[PDB]
Amino acid sequence: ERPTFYRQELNKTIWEVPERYQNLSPVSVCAAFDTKTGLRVAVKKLSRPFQSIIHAKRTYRELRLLKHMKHENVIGLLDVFTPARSLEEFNDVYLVTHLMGADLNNIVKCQKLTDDHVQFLIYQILRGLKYIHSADIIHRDLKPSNLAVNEDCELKILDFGLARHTDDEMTGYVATRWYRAPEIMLNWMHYNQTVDIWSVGCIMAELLTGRTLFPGTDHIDQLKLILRLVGTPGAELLKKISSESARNYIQSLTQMPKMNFANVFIGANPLAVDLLEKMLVLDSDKRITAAQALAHAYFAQYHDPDDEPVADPYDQSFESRDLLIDEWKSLTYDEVISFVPPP
Ligand SMILES: Oc1cccc(-c2nnc(NCc3c(F)cccc3Cl)[nH]2)c1
Incomplete structure (x- = not known):
């Protein structure tokens, strides 16, 4: 079930992504070709997503928002992935969207x-x-x-x-x-x-x-x-x-x-x-x-x-919550591994 990942240095940063994504080009955001869907995609690699409480909560916020949006006129999430195989290893988040013109x-x-x-x-x-x-x-x-x-x-x-x-x-x-x-x-x-x-x-x-x-x-x-x-x-x-x-x-x-x-x-x-x-x-x-x-x-x-x-209702009660970095990280990890791609 876990895809195979491959590594590439792009403007002095290591990108590790599933093989389906090819032709990664910086535009950090990269344009790429999703060979599995035929789609031109934008891939965002989050910068140090869990380095502080404020950053960890922002990472959770962005993922929560992108996972919710399912509308023709709003950017939505085609994919989210991490090369980590466990919560303990989890330190990178990549977000994939349609590439607009x-x-x-x-x-x-x-x-x-x-x-x-x-x-x-x-x-x-x-x-x-x-x-x-x-x-x-x-x-x-x-x-x-x-x-x-x-x-x-x-x-x-x-x-x-x-x-x-x-x-x-x-x-x-x-x-x-x-x-x-x-x-x-x-x-x-x-x-x-x-x-x-x-x-x-x-x-x-x-x-x-x-x-x-x-x-x-x-x-x-x-x-x-x-x-x-x-x-x-x-x-x-x-x-x-x-x-x-x-x-x-x-x-x-x-x-x-x-x-x-x-x-x-x-x-x-x-x-x-x-x-x-x-x-x-x-x-x-x-x-x-x-x-x-x-x-x-x-x-x-x-x-x-x-x-x-x-839209379906969107629960943003987390906004009022004060949690530790590892608690925001665990919430984010749950959202990554539960992601279901759209049709
Ligand atoms: O300013 C421009 C110009 C051309 C395409 C694009 C573009 N197309 N898709 C996107 N998505 C960016 C993106 C991610 F890559 C990941 C998460 C959220 C967003 Cl908005 N940007 C933006």
């Missing part, structure tokens, strides 16, 4: 798309988001670089459970921050699923115009760009900013009304403008949800309420 950041850089492509790409993101949000999974980091497409314009959402960004990585004129909802960028309040809809709005705007919507040079500049478009917060939203210091700062800004989005997105389909106004609402309680957006008339060409499935 390219990501939106690489394909659509500086380019506006036709309206039909914006409809189809945003439709597919929202279909995937309906699925993940129905499991109370929040992506939290949607941006063009973790949205991948194939040559048929079919899209998958990537990168779940990744290591939380450092302060330096979120600093300055950086795409790591341009798509974040203001309540998470400035820690206004406990955030929820609606943060992902803000990112979809920023992404949809950029597909329509070819331009970053809120290319802030830093957190404060970005907030000013945001509030110029959507207006400064009103009294109801201010009360929900539980961060007293954040609430006090935003009240120091001169009040500004929401702009006319038809004058910002000149020439765009009025249905696209309407949908953007319903996504890019400052108060997260009032943003359109993914399920609601799928029924918006902008997507009339694509919407099928019988083919927009929800």
